[PDB]
């Protein structure tokens, strides 16, 4: 009689708890509602902002005249001057540049490779290691890895 | 894995700047023409206020959304703990009836 | 040791390919500049074919998004059946615990 | 953006051309290596798996290879008394066998 009378009580309590978390449930999904609605209104701001612009720019950026269209090539060449380390880099000799970091990169992809077979070797080493150390504690319980 | 780790980023090093020494090599074309010229900055004024404008409006949309996912995910652990609360509440239920 | 320079040699045929392939995933997307390859071919006006472009990845946004979102919503599922198994069986070892 | 920002000038699809040359290029490389003309950027994850399983066969072979080499470190002298060993209590014995 007494332990059923426990259990009620602890019913009682989980019920309470059950209360509780459904309450903050409801709470959580109606802001998770509302956060969905405030994002969805936040998108359509900004798709409506970006139609309206290029409706106003529609006659500004189709007469573009292939004049502007070589800004785009200077860019390209400064941002390849500071990536690449080579401030005398201009597009006469910017081939042999090209082949030798080609070289370059094709040389680094060998070497990942090479790196990667003694990582693959050695990361299934340790697995099977692994595999060991769990088949011991599995069998035996708790014990270090020299134990094994 | 460190080791292999530094060749990564330096493969992908190389290959960005193998890249960009294509791009060069590709607008070569572009650069040949680059005596060209052309009108600029007829209407920049509204384009660039509107342009402020949208920047700040997808600014406010990547906080929405930051806060879309953030709350997806509290609502998703609530729900979890919910649902531990159901099956403690249900198993000790039964129990009592067995008892 | 024959055969074991014989396996490296096999290994790093496979790790060529591998790496290979996992280049074009990677490269996935590039596959759809095709239209923008096209496109830049134009040479012309062409925002009529940047809004058809923007409009097919609209559609192929719209069903990533309901597929993600679906998909959310079974590994929700599946979750809340994991928590409630777990906290079912917290209490029936702690009832074995007491018997 | 680009159709908002036109004034962006095709410097993007200048940049998506050149990718998509890069990626038909690595298409035909992989086409080669893997010898696969029969290949499409869709499908190509599965022979992408079935050669991620090929190279964990061969890395595990090579791994299993790597232990028989380090233990391949005993001296002759071992063989011989092991051998030696096994001959006495069960007889003649090829080391093959043994």
Not at chain 1, 5 to 27: A, I, P
Not at chain 1, 129 to 141: D, M, P, S
């Amino acid at each position: 009689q007494e332990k059923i009378d426990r259990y009620q009580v602890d019913l009682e309590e989980l019920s309470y708890r059950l209360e509780e978390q459904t309450d903050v449930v409801e709470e959580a999904g109606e802001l998770q509602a509302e956060y969905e609605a405030r994002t969805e209104a936040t998108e359509q701001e900004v798709d409506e902002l970006k139609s309206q612009l290029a409706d106003y720019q529609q006659a500004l950026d189709v007469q573009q005249t292939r004049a502007i269209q070589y800004q785009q090539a200077l860019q390209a060449l400064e941002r390849a001057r500071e990536l690449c380390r080579l401030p005398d880099l201009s597009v006469d000799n910017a081939e042999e540049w090209l082949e030798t970091f080609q070289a370059k990169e094709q040389q680094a992809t060998e070497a990942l490779l090479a790196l990667e077979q003694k990582l693959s070797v050695a990361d299934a080493a340790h697995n099977q290691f692994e595999q060991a150390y769990q088949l011991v504690k599995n069998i035996v319980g708790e014990t270090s890895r020299s134990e094994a | 894995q460190q080791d292999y780790e530094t060749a990564k980023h330096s493969q992908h090093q190389a290959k960005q700047q193998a890249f960009a020494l294509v791009e060069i090599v590709q607008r070569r074309v572009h650069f040949s023409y680059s005596d060209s010229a052309g009108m600029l900055s007829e209407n920049a004024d509204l384009n660039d206020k509107l342009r402020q404008r949208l920047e700040h409006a997808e600014s406010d949309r990547s906080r929405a959304r930051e806060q879309l996912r953030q709350q997806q995910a509290q609502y998703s652990q609530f729900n979890q703990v919910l649902a531990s609360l159901k099956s403690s509440y249900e198993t000790k239920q039964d129990m009592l009836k067995e008892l």
